Structures are given as structure tokens and as C-alpha cells.
From a paper:
The bison [name] construct used for structural studies is referred to as [name]ΔN, because it does not include the first 69 residues of the N-terminal tail. The bison [name]ΔN sample preparation was subsequently optimized for grid preparation, cryo-EM data acquisition and structural determination at pH 8.0. The final cryo-EM map of [name]ΔN in detergent was estimated at 3.0 Å (Fourier shell correlation (FSC) = 0.143 criterion), although protomer A was consistently better aligned than protomer B, and was therefore resolved at a higher resolution. The observed additional N-terminal helix TM –1 is part of the dimer domain in [name]ΔN and is domain-swapped, mediating homodimerization by interacting with TM8 and the TM8–TM9 loop in the neighboring protomer. As a result of the tilted angle of TM –1 and the length of the connecting loop to TM1, the [name]ΔN protomers are held apart by ~ 25 Å on the intracellular side. Before masked refinement we also observed additional map density for a predicted short helical segment prior to TM −1, which sits at right angles to the protein. Finally, the modeled N-terminal extension helix is also highly positively charged and is reminiscent of the positively charged extension helix seen in the oligomeric betamine transporter BetP, which binds to negatively charged lipids in response to a change in cell volume.
The Na+/H+ exchanger SLC9B2, also known as [name], correlates with the long-sought-after Na+/Li+ exchanger linked to the pathogenesis of diabetes mellitus and essential hypertension in humans. Here we report the cryo-EM structures of bison [name] in detergent and in nanodiscs, at 3.0 and 3.5 Å resolution, respectively. [name] consists of 14 transmembrane (TM) segments, rather than the 13 TMs previously observed in mammalian Na+/H+ exchangers (NHEs) and related bacterial antiporters. The additional N-terminal helix in [name] forms a unique homodimer interface with a large intracellular gap between the protomers, which closes in the presence of phosphoinositol lipids.
Residue numbers in the entry:
A (entry chain A), B (entry chain B): 70 to 293, 300 to 517
């Protein structure tokens, strides 16, 4: 009985794993019993959890083992690669499938989470100190990049201006989902004196989404008035944010307890509800500005406990981020291997991004930013995120409803170039800003 | 602006309510968005929450306001009355409905929870000190009460012995769901020296359910062999409990952290899975003994942290109890007002309960219990619980499948008398034992 005596003391190396496996299988059985639909290996909820775990392990691997010597390996590239691998394997694409509506809802939820996290961390008096530079950085470079991309596309691909206008509007847009965490980390660190520069970027790269989607919708309609519709959407979002601000302003008082969890849940639910209501009513994207205005008003309410809830919101964002990246990167199966002289698209997107950098450097030549701040701001505006993927999916769906072969091919080319741009410029830009933060604004 | 100045300081009296209402409506909207099915006011999940809240408020009212001077008002009566009111109002019965399968699953879950809570709190060495009295109290009085009830029914109602046998088997059964909390509270209190008496009752009033259901199934089949089937079920339950005991015995070790939550979740999930597997395979009720054996083995594992998990399991049971009572009491709509000379049924059930008390006093005349312990044990075995309702529902469903009018009427009479017995003897017995605990075994 030597083996029995030796194995009598439990071995935590071989005991922890068994306990974890038993707990996981028990939870999975409970989930299956509660709902036998979309919980099987061929279901959606199983696929969501599998994608979440794959994104988590990919992010860990891209940064814990094969990270470069000086620059750490960002997890964004790992998450995008995991999504690409999940989507682009036929034998591992039929087993795991996700509903389009669920994907869109999760994308909206993640965008609302990152927007409210950015708004909560914003510092006051920045608007009064320098709002003009923020407004110019929000307005100018987006339109300039869209126009330059349209010009570059024209006389190059042969598509009419309507397709060129749509491509320029789609490409010329930066979504804060990829840049906000970097700005928040930089502000938490701090180099020299942060004279509102991180908050400046956070505010500037937030509400250009409404203008981008308005232009895209107008161009799509012309390819098939609404500028006033978008203006009304902006006004409605501002008014809703102003109205909702007075609620967190007073209802949470010192009398109540557990203010952290209650306030965080309240603001997150309000943001999600506003975004979903705006999308359902018929004018999506206004909730994106509404939640930012609500967070700004909550800061104006002098909550004095931002860091109490900032930690919880940061944890929630860290949970949601791999899911968001996997959802974005797991919708490229159609063009998995379609070489159609993609080098033209690569050249167009690269030239457009370079023009964006140049104009962003031009847009910050007024005052304050001498050299290093100019360069950092220019390189910070570079990346793009979920907004481009969502608008491209909408454009492709519209094209494949009453369109012929030529329009289908044009939409396919636009979707491919947009996906490639999202794949390239986002993680490279994130790594660049992460490495340049401690190296430019010290 | 006098009103504005006066209302400028928030009033927590009028502010807490608004915040709670906003949180509740936000959660309800989230639930509706996640699932638009069975979450509407006409759905099931809405009905479950409404029943839970009604049971909670009824239990609070029956004990916080209209409690008698010396004896506090038990909440069991309030919960049963709330269930009766919910079920027996046509305009408030169509709006809230609950699936039969969901009700049965929740009943099984609650029974498993109370069984594992009883088993965890059991004290060792009690079996070796006096197991014979426990075995006799488990076996004898159940069969004697069933036989006496059958005899009383015969020559009284005119139904044949097959119906009389079924009625006696159904009536002659005590389910621990109503007595275990009282025993645990009494053991926590302690009067003089508790020489295993509470644990004796907890063990004795646990595994008679298998014998009761086996007899009921055999009688139902005869009305349409299985004794060996029930014996095999008991053996299978014992073997499964023995096998599962070695798992909590070693897998949770000192290396792991958060032992309380992990162990509690593990044991609860194992009990639920065992009960559901036993029910699905074709031999229900064996999991009821299996979970008790598993808890006894976990105690034999010297967990030394029972009170750490006993608190959590007690909280879970306190959550589930109003739901269980509401589910039991919300299935009497058919016979809401059907006076069919019910006094005969009342007399039969009263005589049967009195005979149960007399034989229980007779069964404890061996040793140890001198006078007061005898009386307390006799009065403790009195109540009945969910088991009778479940078996009566099964009997009625079997009757209304291939049966004629006479069999339907017999089944209806049996169901009515069973419901009346559950209504009467359970809360009265609970209040009696609660008041007599500090007054008999001091």
C-alpha cells in the first residue's frame, strides 16, 4: 500500500485542477438545464463563452511569452488574431456561431461602457481652458481625411463618387474604443504636468462618431435632407444627457449606503438604455454623446468618489474588451483568401492615414503643444475601431438587398479594405502610443 | 424660490424610494431585453418574482404586526395564505401563471436544499449512540398511520381498498421541509444538554419519504413487483452518496482559497444534480437519501468549517422557503369553493393525526426519553410538507389520463383532503414546536 500511503496527502497540483473542472462542468450543466437552447456546443451562449476564453488566452499569450524585448506585445493583436482564426476555419465555424443581433447589441454595450469610462475620468475646467482645439481636432481632420481618401480612391479604382464618398466617410473615422484605455493609463501614470492633454484627447476623439455616421447615411441615401436629421439627433442627445444629469446629481445622497456599486450600476444602465433607445427609435449614435454628457454632468455633480467607481468600471471594461475585439475580428470569413490586387487598397489606406497624421499635426499648431505634444496628439488620432466595422456591415447589408453584381463587388471591396485597415492601424497604433507615452511627454 | 431653497437639500425619505424604483425598473428592463419571453406580466418569470415578493410580505406581516401576545405568529401560515390568495382569484390567476415543470423543479431544488442543510448540521456519534430508536421512528409510525387512515376511510366513504390504500399512503408521511428549520434553531439555542435529540429527529424524519413514495407507486400500479424496485433505489442512493462522499473528502484542501463558497456551491450542485438525475432516470426520491448521505460523509470528512458554510446554506434556505410555500399553496384553484361534506375528510385526517401522535408516543417508550422528550418527539413528527402535495398531484394526473368519472371524483376528494391536511397540520405544528421547544426540554 505504498502508493496509497504516498497519495494519502492531497496534491494541490493535481487537486486544484480537478476541483476547477468539477465546478466548471457543474455550472455548464446548470446552464444547460436552465436553457437547453443556444447553450449546446452548436449554440450561441456556448460560442460566446468560447470566444471570450479564446480572446483572453490570446491576449495573455501576446504579451506574456512572445513579447519583444523593449516593447511589450499588446493584447489587441492577439485578440484580433483569435477572432480571425475563429471565424476563418470552416470546421471551427459551423460548430460556433453567433447571432448578428446579439453581436450588434454587445458591440453597442461595449462602446457605451468605454464611453462612460472615458467620460467619468475626464477632468473639469479643461473645456473652459481649451475647448477650441478640441472642437477643431474633432471636426477638421475627420472631414479632411474623408475628402483625401475619396480623392485617392477616385481615378484609381474606377468606382463613382458615390462609392468613393462612402469609402472616404467610412475610412475617415476614429472610434475611442481603442484609444481611451491608453489615455486613461497615461493619465494615471502622469509625466511632468498633464495640462489636460489626456482629457483633451478623450473629449476630442468621442463625438466625431455622430458626424461620421451622419455622413455615411447621407451618402448611402444619395447612392440609393438628413443633415438636419443628424443635427436634431445631436441636439436630442445633448438634451437627454442634460436631463439625465440632474438625476445622478441628487438622487444618490449620503443617506444611502453602498454608493459605489449603486452609482456605477445606475450610470451604466442609464447609458445602455439611452444607447438602445436611440438605436431602436430610428436615430442611432446619439446615445454615444448622451452618455458622455451624462458622465460629464456626474463629474459636475462633484461625486468626489470617481476612483471608487472608476475601479469597478475599469474591471468591467477589462472584461468586455476581449469580447468586443473577438466580435469585431470574427466576421471576415467571406474574404478569408480573396487576392484581388489588394495592394491598391493597402496603398489607399496608408496614404489616407498618412494624410490624417499630417493634418492632425497641422490642426495642433495654434498654441500650447510645442513639438512633442504635437507629435503625440498626431499619432494618437491615428487608430480606428468598432465604428468602421459596424458601418461597413450596414453598408454591405444595404448593398445585398436590392443591388446587382457591380454594387455587390464594390461593397465587398469596401468591406475588405475597411477590415484590413482595422486589422492594421488599430493594434499598431495602440502599441505605438503605449510605447511613446513614457517617451514623448516626459 | 422658497420651495426651491427648501427642497435643495435632498430628502432621504423621498429620495431612497425613487432610487430603489429606478434600480428596479432598470433591472426589469434589462431582464425584458435579455428575454422577451416569459418575462412579460403574463409570463412565468414575472409570476415567480411576484409570488416570491407576495410570500415575503405575507411572512413579514404574519409575525411583525398581528402576532399574538405570547406566541409569535409563524410566517408559514402567511406564506400559505398568500399562495391560496394568488391561486384562488380568477382575475389574478390568468395574469400570473407558472409552468408545472418549473414548479416541480423548484420544489425538488428546495427539498434538496433543506435536506443538505439538515445533513450538514447533523452531529456525529449519534447513530452509534442510538440508531435503533431513529430507525423505529422512521419505519413504524408511518406504516401504522397509513394503515389506521386506510381503516378509518374504509366503511366511511365507500371507496375500495385500492383508493383507501393510496389515501393512507399519501396522508401517512412527514416531509422534513417544515420541521428541519425548527430543529436547527432549537439545536442552535440549546436547553440543558442536547443529547442528540434534535439530530435524532433530523435523521429520523428524512428517509421515510422513499418508503412513502414506493408504497404510493405500488398502490397506484395495483389500482391500474415494485417493492424490489424501491429497495434497489434505496441501495443505489446509498451507493451514490458513499461514492460522492470521497470527493468532498479530499478535493477541497487547505491549498485552495475561498473554501466556504466553493464547498457550499459544490455540495449544493452535487445534491441538485443527484436529485435531478434520479428523477429523470426513472426512480425519483433516491437523491433525497443520497444528499443526506453525502452531507453525513462530508461531516465524517471533518470539514471543521460547518458554521462557515452553514450560514450560507441557511441564507439560501431562507430565500427558497417562501418560494416553496407559495408554490405548494398556489395549486388549489379547482376546489376553491366545493363544499362536498368536507367534515368527513376533516374527521378522518384529525383521527389519523391523533393516531400518529399516539403511536409516536408509543414508539419512544424504550429508553432515554422520560416524559418531556417523549411528548416533544411525538408532537414533532406531526406535520407534513411538499411530499404530500407532489404525490397528490401525481395521483390526480394519473387519474385524469385514462379514468372515468368515479375515479376522477375519488382523486378529487383525495387531493382536497390532502390539501386541507397540508394547510392545517403544517403551520399549526410548526408554531406548536416553536413555542414548546423552550417550554418542554429545558
Amino acid at each position: 500500500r505504498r502508493r496509497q500511503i504516498h497519495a494519502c496527502p492531497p496534491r494541490g497540483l493535481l487537486a486544484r485542477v480537478i476541483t476547477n473542472v468539477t465546478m466548471v462542468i457543474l455550472l455548464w450543466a446548470v446552464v444547460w438545464s436552465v436553457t437547453g437552447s443556444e447553450c449546446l456546443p452548436g449554440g450561441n451562449l456556448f460560442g460566446i463563452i468560447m470566444l471570450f476564453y479564446c480572446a483572453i488566452i490570446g491576449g495573455k499569450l501576446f504579451g506574456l511569452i512572445k513579447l519583444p524585448t523593449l516593447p511589450p506585445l499588446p493584447p489587441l493583436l492577439g485578440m484580433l488574431l483569435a477572432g480571425f482564426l475563429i471565424r476563418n476555419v470552416p470546421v471551427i465555424s459551423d460548430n460556433i456561431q453567433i447571432k448578428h443581433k446579439w453581436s450588434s447589441a454587445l458591440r453597442s454595450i461595449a462602446l457605451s461602457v468605454i464611453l462612460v469610462r472615458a467620460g467619468l475620468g475626464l477632468d473639469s475646467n479643461a473645456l473652459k481652458k481649451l475647448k477650441g482645439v478640441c472642437v477643431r481636432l474633432s471636426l477638421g481632420p475627420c472631414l479632411i481625411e474623408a475628402c483625401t481618401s475619396a480623392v485617392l480612391a477616385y481615378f484609381l479604382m474606377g468606382l463613382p463618387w458615390q462609392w468613393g464618398f462612402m469609402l472616404g466617410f467610412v475610412l475617415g473615422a476614429v472610434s475611442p474604443a481603442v484609444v481611451v484605455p491608453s489615455m486613461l493609463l497615461l493619465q494615471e501614470g502622469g509625466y511632468g504636468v498633464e495640462k489636460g492633454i489626456p482629457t483633451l484627447l478623450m473629449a476630442a476623439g468621442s463625438f466625431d462618431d455622430i458626424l461620421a455616421i451622419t455622413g455615411f447615411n447621407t451618402c448611402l441615401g444619395m447612392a440609393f435632407f438628413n443633415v438636419l436629421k443628424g443635427v436634431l439627433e445631436v441636439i436630442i442627445g445633448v438634451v437627454t444627457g442634460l436631463v439625465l444629469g440632474f438625476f445622478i446629481q441628487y438622487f444618490p445622497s449620503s443617506d444611502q449606503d453602498n454608493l459605489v456599486w449603486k452609482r456605477a450600476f445606475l450610470v451604466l444602465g442609464l447609458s445602455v438604455l439611452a444607447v438602445f433607445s436611440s438605436t431602436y427609435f430610428g436615430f442611432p449614435g446619439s446615445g454615444g454623446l448622451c452618455t458622455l454628457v451624462t458622465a460629464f454632468l456626474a463629474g459636475r455633480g462633484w461625486a468626489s468618489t470617481k476612483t471608487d467607481v472608476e475601479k469597478v468600471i475599469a474591471v468591467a471594461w477589462d472584461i468586455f474588451q476581449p469580447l468586443l475585439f473577438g466580435l469585431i475580428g470574427a466576421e471576415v470569413l467571406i474574404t478569408a483568401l480573396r487576392p484581388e490586387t489588394i495592394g491598391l487598397c493597402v496603398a489607399t489606406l496608408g496614404i489616407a492615414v498618412l494624410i490624417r497624421i499630417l493634418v492632425t499635426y497641422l490642426m495642433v499648431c495654434f498654441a500650447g503643444f510645442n513639438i512633442k505634444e504635437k507629435i503625440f496628439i498626431s499619432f494618437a488620432w491615428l487608430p480606428k475601431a468598432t465604428v468602421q466595422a459596424a458601418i461597413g456591415s450596414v453598408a454591405l447589408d444595404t448593398a445585398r438587398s436590392h443591388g446587382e453584381k457591380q454594387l455587390e463587388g464594390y461593397g465587398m471591396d469596401v468591406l475588405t479594405v475597411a477590415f484590413l485597415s482595422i486589422i492594421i492601424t488599430a493594434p499598431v497604433g495602440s502599441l505605438l502610443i503605449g510605447l511613446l507615452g513614457p517617451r514623448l511627454l516626459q
